[PDB]
Design a protein around this ligand. Structure first.
Ligand SMILES: CC(C)=CCC/C(C)=C/CC/C(C)=C/CC/C(C)=C/CC/C(C)=C/CC/C(C)=C/CC/C(C)=C/CC/C(C)=C/CC/C(C)=C/CC1=C(C)C(=O)c2ccccc2C1=O
Ligand SMILES: CC(C)=CCC/C(C)=C/CC/C(C)=C/CC/C(C)=C/CC/C(C)=C/CC/C(C)=C/CC/C(C)=C/CC/C(C)=C/CC/C(C)=C/CC1=C(C)C(=O)c2ccccc2C1=O
Ligand SMILES: CC(C)=CCC/C(C)=C/CC/C(C)=C/CC/C(C)=C/CC/C(C)=C/CC/C(C)=C/CC/C(C)=C/CC/C(C)=C/CC/C(C)=C/CC1=C(C)C(=O)c2ccccc2C1=O
Ligand SMILES: CC(C)=CCC/C(C)=C/CC/C(C)=C\CC/C(C)=C/CC/C(C)=C/CC/C(C)=C/CC/C(C)=C/CC/C(C)=C/CC/C(C)=C/CC1=C(C)C(=O)c2ccccc2C1=O
Ligand SMILES: CC(C)=CCC/C(C)=C/CC/C(C)=C\CC/C(C)=C/CC/C(C)=C/CC/C(C)=C/CC/C(C)=C/CC/C(C)=C/CC/C(C)=C/CC1=C(C)C(=O)c2ccccc2C1=O
Ligand SMILES: CCCCCCCCCCCCCCCC(=O)O[C@H](COC(=O)CCCCCCC[C@@H](C)CCCCCCCCC)COP(=O)(O)O[C@H]1[C@H](O)[C@H](O)[C@@H](O)[C@@H](O)[C@@H]1O
Ligand SMILES: CCCCCCCCCCCCCCCC(=O)O[C@H](COC(=O)CCCCCCC[C@@H](C)CCCCCCCCC)COP(=O)(O)O[C@H]1[C@H](O)[C@H](O)[C@@H](O)[C@@H](O)[C@@H]1O
Ligand code: HEM
Ligand code: HEM
Ligand code: HEM
Ligand code: HEM
Ligand SMILES: CCCCCCCCCCCCCCCC(=O)OC[C@H](C)OC(=O)CCCCCCCC[C@@H](C)CCCCCCCC
Lengths: 51, 102, 533, 24, 535
């Protein structure tokens, strides 16, 4: 293997764009966590029975 | 593509030596008996394994008014004795109380 | 900390199994980054979900034909005489918490499995990845599809409802006993007597949960091992040759992408498995020989076989007090398709006389005859699939039911001929479209009026020009060419910031310089590597 | 590292020796 | 013309997959040739036969508790109300040609599997093949044993006869609802209600044919891969070091031997499954709560668990209006022997303070404490196994049924101690037996009767001799020693020929010469290699 090209994503440090991008990734993971908790709570407390 | 010549030559020599050194090819009597025996055992085993679930579909098993007959020749409408009365019944419902009536 | 636990674990592992040279090789393997190479993963990801859900269902199901009376919670079926399988299938969906969701996800995943296999097969055929040395892999795949198509058939036949019951009665009992000489013997061997019998559902259950999945797993393992140890193919491009691979290493880029794709596939399957209804077996009722409905249709991966029965004429023979029914034709016709799909590479190898080692793919436009053949096969498949749904098309879309059969009958000989011709011409035209850019350049879409009144259209050459202005023509290299100026970066760099508020000018300048500088480096590296060979 | 010329000049006896020696 | 046929199909494979070096490496793998190392594959050969027989018994069985009336061919059970599982089990044995034979072979192979696993475990333990770097393999094997036990238990519970039903009511139901906190919750989760239920046989069927065999297959694969890539240990001997393997190559000697052994194991199993009756379910009846028989025995691999129940006293506790039954004591006990079995290598490593990457085995006589511990464990196992069948021994042999319980109860604390002591002393004595031959030589069994009236025995020195004729003492090297003169070649061939007629003399002379020369060459080669190693 040779690996002709390799570069980091943020050369210039201390930018507001990098911080903003850092907070976008977190939102999806927080949404996943909240949805998991919702799954737990709905599976425990819901009628579920044939009417 | 193709492996280097050294690997090909060595692997071929190994296999050829294994076959040749056994002196199996020089001994026709025992090389033939092995084949025959393996064939016979295989045939026997396969017939025993498969022959358990083979049934004759043309054997008389259904009692009728003319003797026992094969399944595919009969139905619910075939008389079981001469002069038997078979009614045309309807089905409505009531699974346990007379599902069939005249 | 973790600078001491990880080192101890690594030392303990290495001193016992010494796997450093063989584990580095796996981390350094490179894989091409394409969107057409992720079509083979979906199927795999569909199989795993079919296992997990398949095990949960085994803790509740009872595959017996013993007749019982329901006496359960679902009121419209209270006193009805049914089998143990049907009762247990109702129990799973009505009595066990979250059972309906699980058995819906199972069915949806079963559909996705077949769809993904079909798309993957299409990719493999059209790109030419079946040529040597990979024509052994194709055969393996050709088996897997077949195994995936009967495995699904045995699966929805387990609840023992009216729809699947009539399906079994028609497609497995009628056809079996229509075959010459060895026909009734085979029927009685499979069913252990006449059609209804007593041992069909247990046998199908054992065949569905144990044997066919085992064979599928082994064959999938062989498939993946062959793919791994033979390497992956690649499309022609800058820096790509017949004796190298260009892409990314397994660690850490490929693994993260694979994991994310698996997660998203699971998400989609779980989301659609609890928002759409599939197979509501309680609406159907238990199987009765004397009852039928209007639909009578199998799963989508089985409808072409049913359409072939539905369309073929009533041609029979009666030699010396025997019978050769219509259903024989289909049994032969189905055998040919499977015999004309397992060994295609050898047919094409014999025809074209090409027997060379191939690692670089082909663009569908560069092989007109193969593309036309594939198109005509797809057309025939689609027509046979849509001919199974003729009795719903006639009702919804106001067509005669008599007309649909004749449409299909004429179509199954007419439509492929049209499709072949159109596909051939279309491929050659795309080829001619690729030569226009190499000679004149990309059309910018800008018109200019010269002083003497001429209208000209500005072109962007892709290479050096001569001393009059028109570019030096370039050669075709089997690679795509641009057709829009926006894809060449000729326009577009929006002001950095949020969606509503901008960033400082200094930050914008610093961020826009870096991108351009980085963008040069990749092209330069590729050019240098290409020039060194 | 024998050449293609020498590998054709060896009998079956010493090719097995070479293979074994390569394997250890 | 197969020379041209094999030369073309060989090139077609190398040009597509190029597996020349990779398979050439696998053809040259060397394996030690010791009888004791063939113990492990028997189990493997028993597993394969369990799969082929398991697929033939999947075409006829129906797991259901739906109650029916028999009305079949077997007359003594005509009109009796049974389940679908029992009826199908009768159908397999009476209505299908060769079904009884197949299910008998299945059961016999099931027994051989467990027996082979036990013997293999004994071998691994006694020779110290678990030390380093082979601990994970021990653990995996332990899990395999446990899974095999539970796989076997779920198997004979499927026909739903009187024996299996009585066994499953007492073991899987009675013991389950004794665990202190989660006693009744777990019971109702497993059975989906009260004991009999309607889902137990289907659940056990799905568990027996799919899940446990899958886990077993995966674990066996891992086991074999570890053995293959960790280069099987060997035993101390001439030309053996810590960094080499002595034996034969895979091609062609090892493969032929493996194939022949598999064939003979299959032969034995097939021969045994026709001449001996196992599990006659028609002599029993369908399971009924208000019916029982005298025997009530599980399979031999489950007998120690059942014997532990019979011998433990009736000790219960009643705190704050609760109950802790007798059955708790075994549930804790049963999981305590397992825990002590999986994590044994770590215990011994901590005790002796030794971890030095051993590749050479130990003779059991050289490690007295471990040998004694193993003997003690085997004694306890045997006593627990024989306690389960105390009602059958009390009938056939004239002894009180009350007396057997007390014998077992007292024995389970006394007999292991005696076995430990005897094993320790016996091992040390076998050690001392080896020091007598390295110092004086092999006793030929010949008396001399010197002129002055002294009786001596002629000894055969195993090495160089001193000027006075007394042998030079040798050092122990962890290898066996000869003790009979006939094993050293003090006896020729009676003569070349048939059993009734001899051959010409010249042939006999030539054959004897060749054999003798071949023995010289082999010994010389080993000696030269051993001399070059230690330079
Ligand atoms: C220097 C020098 C010149 C030397 C080098 C030279 C060199 C190296 C070159 C030489 C290379 C060369 C020459 C190589 C040539 C190689 C070559 C030519 C190879 C050819 C390979 C080849 C021809 C392959 C054979 C293909 C093959 C064996 C075909 C398979 C046939 C198949 C797959 C048939 C299966 C048919 C089948 C199983 C049918 C089942 C039908 C039945 C009974 C089903 C009935 C049926 C059932 C059962 C239902 O249940 C059902 C349910 C619902 C709806 C319908 C049905 C239904 O129809
Ligand atoms: C002899 C016999 C009867 C055997 C039958 C065998 C058979 C049919 C199998 C059945 C399975 C059986 C019976 C096993 C029982 C196991 C068992 C009891 C477990 C219960 C499970 C359970 C309780 C559920 C818990 C639910 C839960 C928490 C779920 C978690 C889901 C998890 C952990 C997912 C794991 C995902 C996973 C294993 C992914 C692996 C992906 C792999 C292998 C890809 C490899 C791979 C990759 C990644 C590529 O991208 C690729 C690209 C190009 C070429 C090649 C490759 C390639 O090789
Ligand atoms: C009590 C109860 C209710 C049960 C619950 C069960 C339970 C809780 C269990 C938990 C167990 C635990 C905790 C462990 C976790 C393990 C785990 C994570 C499991 C995962 C399982 C899983 C993911 C499933 C995959 C299954 C699967 C498809 C695996 C494939 C394995 C394969 C391909 C194996 C091949 C084996 C094979 C083909 C055997 C051939 C045998 C032959 C012919 C022998 C040849 C052979 C010979 C002859 C030799 O003598 C020999 C000697 C020395 C070295 C080598 C060899 C050798 O190769
Ligand atoms: C139902 C009913 C009636 C009963 C149940 C049936 C049942 C239980 C079936 C059992 C069947 C069974 C397990 C049969 C075993 C048959 C066996 C093991 C016979 C083999 C005997 C034999 C000749 C073994 C020696 C192996 C030899 C000669 C190896 C030769 C050899 C081999 C095997 C290669 O594959 C090979 C590949 C590439 C290069 C070289 C070689 C090579 O030298
Ligand atoms: C009842 C009921 C609720 C239904 C059952 C639902 C069901 C079937 C459960 C499935 C659950 C499931 C499959 C979980 C997947 C979890 C995943 C995908 C993990 C999160 C993704 C993540 C952490 C992102 C980073 C990506 C990473 C770390 C890669 C993981 C990874 C994976 C998963 C590969 O496939 C892989 C293949 C080849 C080489 C390497 C990798 C690799 O590293
Ligand atoms: C000397 C004859 C044998 C020559 C040697 C080679 C041929 C043997 C190969 C097969 C071994 C068959 C042995 C099985 C015994 C036998 O022969 O059965 C006799 C039936 O007459 C026969 O001559 C059978 C002729 C075989 C017909 C071939 C069948 C056609 C194929 C298509 C059947 C499907 C097989 C699956 C392969 C399909 C593959 C397709 C890709 C009597 O039938 P019957 O008494 O009515 O039924 C009984 C039950 O009651 C009792 O429970 C028990 O099941 C039996 O005892 C049964 O016989
Ligand atoms: C597996 C080996 C284990 C090694 C451990 C050895 C430990 C031995 C401990 C000794 C056990 C003592 C058992 C006593 C517990 C007990 O209760 O025993 C009674 C009757 O005492 C007896 O006989 C004593 C019998 C002594 C047996 C000694 C055992 C040694 C043997 C087992 C060793 C041989 C090993 C086998 C050799 C095979 C290999 C060869 C090397 C029966 O009561 P019962 O019957 O109800 O008496 C009623 C009245 O009371 C009442 O008046 C009235 O008269 C009636 O109602 C009457 O019934
Ligand atoms: C069960 C169905 C199948 C599964 C799970 C499966 C899986 C895969 C996977 C994951 C790959 C990885 C490479 C890629 O993503 O393209 C692959 C490659 C391949 N598959 Fe499939 N496949 C299946 C069916 C088929 C079929 C139906 C064919 C052809 C009829 C086929 C032939 C191939 C070939 C030739 C390759 C390698 C092509 C190349 O090297 O570029 N497979 N398969
Ligand atoms: C190749 C992947 C699989 C396919 C295509 C498949 C197909 C099907 C289908 C179509 C159904 C009908 C579901 C319904 O009617 O709602 C089903 C149900 C079932 N499958 Fe599978 N299956 C697969 C994997 C498995 C596996 C591996 C097992 C065993 C471990 C299994 C066991 C079951 C069981 C027990 C049912 C219950 C049937 C029902 O509830 O109606 N499946 N399967
Ligand atoms: C590998 C370890 C296995 C062991 C130790 C084992 C053991 C047993 C035993 C002892 C029985 C009952 C014997 C009797 O009295 O009739 C049995 C029954 C059965 N086993 Fe297994 N088994 C194993 C694996 C399998 C596998 C892998 C399958 C399926 C592929 C299978 C299918 C069956 C079937 C269908 C029965 C039916 C009960 C009968 O017909 O008598 N077994 N097993
Ligand atoms: C299904 C059960 C098992 C099978 C099929 C099996 C199979 C084998 C085989 C074939 C070998 C190599 C052949 C030999 O040297 O004897 C082996 C080696 C080994 N097995 Fe087992 N085994 C099983 C269970 C166990 C158990 C219960 C243990 C220990 C608790 C164990 C520990 C080992 C170890 C440590 C080795 C290494 C062999 C060595 O170093 O010499 N295995 N196994
Ligand atoms: C299966 C087909 C295998 C054919 C077996 C032999 C047929 C047994 C005929 C017995 C019979 O019924 O009386 C004849 C029938 C009344 O008159 C006709 O046959 C109409 C004449 C047209 C037939 C064209 C023959 C070519 C057919 C082949 C193209 C098909 C081969 C595939």
């Amino acid at each position: 293997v040779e690996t002709i090209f390799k570069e980091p994503r943020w050369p210039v440090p201390g930018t507001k764009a990098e911080k903003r991008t850092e907070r976008l990734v977190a939102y999806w993971l927080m949404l996943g966590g909240l949805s998991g908790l919702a799954l737990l709570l709905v599976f425990l407390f819901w009628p579920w029975e044939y009417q | 593509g193709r492996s280097p010549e050294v690997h090909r030559k060595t692997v071929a020599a190994n296999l050829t030596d294994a076959l040749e050194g056994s002196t199996l090819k020089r001994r026709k009597v025992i090389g033939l008996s092995l084949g025959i025996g393996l064939g016979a055992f295989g045939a026997g085993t396969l017939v025993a394994f498969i022959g358990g679930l083979i049934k004759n579909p043309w054997k008389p098993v259904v009692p009728t008014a003319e003797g026992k007959k094969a399944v595919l020749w009969t139905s619910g409408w075939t008389p079981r004795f001469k002069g038997e009365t078979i009614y045309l019944a309807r089905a409505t419902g009531r699974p346990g109380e007379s599902p069939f009536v005249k | 900390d973790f600078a001491k636990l990880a080192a101890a674990q690594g030392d303990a592992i290495d001193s016992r199994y010494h796997p450093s040279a063989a584990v580095r090789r796996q981390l350094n393997k490179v894989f091409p980054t394409h969107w057409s190479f992720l079509l083979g993963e979906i199927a795999l990801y569909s199989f795993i979900i079919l296992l997990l859900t398949g095990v949960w269902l085994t803790l509740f199901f009872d595959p017996s034909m013993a007749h019982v009376t329901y006496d359960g919670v679902y009121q419209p079926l209270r006193g009805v005489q049914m089998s143990r399988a049907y009762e247990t299938a109702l129990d799973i969906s009505f009595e066990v918490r979250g059972g309906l969701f699980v058995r819906q996800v199972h069915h949806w995943a079963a559909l996705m499995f077949a769809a993904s296999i079909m798309v993957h097969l299409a990719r493999i055929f059209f790109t030419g990845a079946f040529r040597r040395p990979r024509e052994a892999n194709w055969v393996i795949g050709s088996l897997l599809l077949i195994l995936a198509m009967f495995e699904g058939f045995f699966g929805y036949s387990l609840p023992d409802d009216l729809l699947s019951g009539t399906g079994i009665r028609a497609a497995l009992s009628g056809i079996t006993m229509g075959i010459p000489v060895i026909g009734t013997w085979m029927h009685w061997a499979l069913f252990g007597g006449d059609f209804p019998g007593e041992i069909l559902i247990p046998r199908l259950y054992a065949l569905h949960i144990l044997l066919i999945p085992g064979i599928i797993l082994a064959l999938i393992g062989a498939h993946l091992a062959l793919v791994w140890f033979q390497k992956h193919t690649q499309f022609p491009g800058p820096g790509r040759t017949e004796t190298n691979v260009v892409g990314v290493r397994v660690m850490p880029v490929f693994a993260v992408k694979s994991g994310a794709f698996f997660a998203m596939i699971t998400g989609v399957l779980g989301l659609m498995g609890g928002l759409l209804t599939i197979n509501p077996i309680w609406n159907l009722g238990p199987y009765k020989p004397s009852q039928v409905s209007a639909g009578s249709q199998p799963d989508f991966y089985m409808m072409w076989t049913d359409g072939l029965i539905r369309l073929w004429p009533a041609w029979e023979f009666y030699p010396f007090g025997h019978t050769i029914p219509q259903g024989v034709w289909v049994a032969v016709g189905m055998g040919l398709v499977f015999a004309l799909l397992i060994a295609y590479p050898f047919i094409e190898k014999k025809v074209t006389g090409d027997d060379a080692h191939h690692n670089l793919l082909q663009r569908p436009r560069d092989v007109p005859v193969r593309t036309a053949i594939g198109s005509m096969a797809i057309a025939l498949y689609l027509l046979l699939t849509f001919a199974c749904m003729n009795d719903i098309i006639a009702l919804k879309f106001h067509i005669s039911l008599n007309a649909t059969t004749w449409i299909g009958r004429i179509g199954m000989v007419v439509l492929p001929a049209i499709v072949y011709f159109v596909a051939y011409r279309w491929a050659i035209s795309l080829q001619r479209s690729d030569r226009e850019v190499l000679e004149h350049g990309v059309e910018t879409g800008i018109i200019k009026r010269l002083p003497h009144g001429a209208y000209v259209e500005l072109h962007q050459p892709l290479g050096p020009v001569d001393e009059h202005g028109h570019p030096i023509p370039l050669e075709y290299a089997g690679a795509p060419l641009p057709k829009r100026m926006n894809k060449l970066g000729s326009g577009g760099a929006p002001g950095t910031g949020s969606f509503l508020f901008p960033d400082p000018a200094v930050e914008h300048e610093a961020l826009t310089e870096a991108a351009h500088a980085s963008e040069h480096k990749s092209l330069t590296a590729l050019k240098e590597h290409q020039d060194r060979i | 590292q024998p050449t293609d010329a020498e590998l054709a000049e060896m009998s079956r006896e010493e090719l097995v020796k070479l293979g074994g020696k390569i394997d250890g």
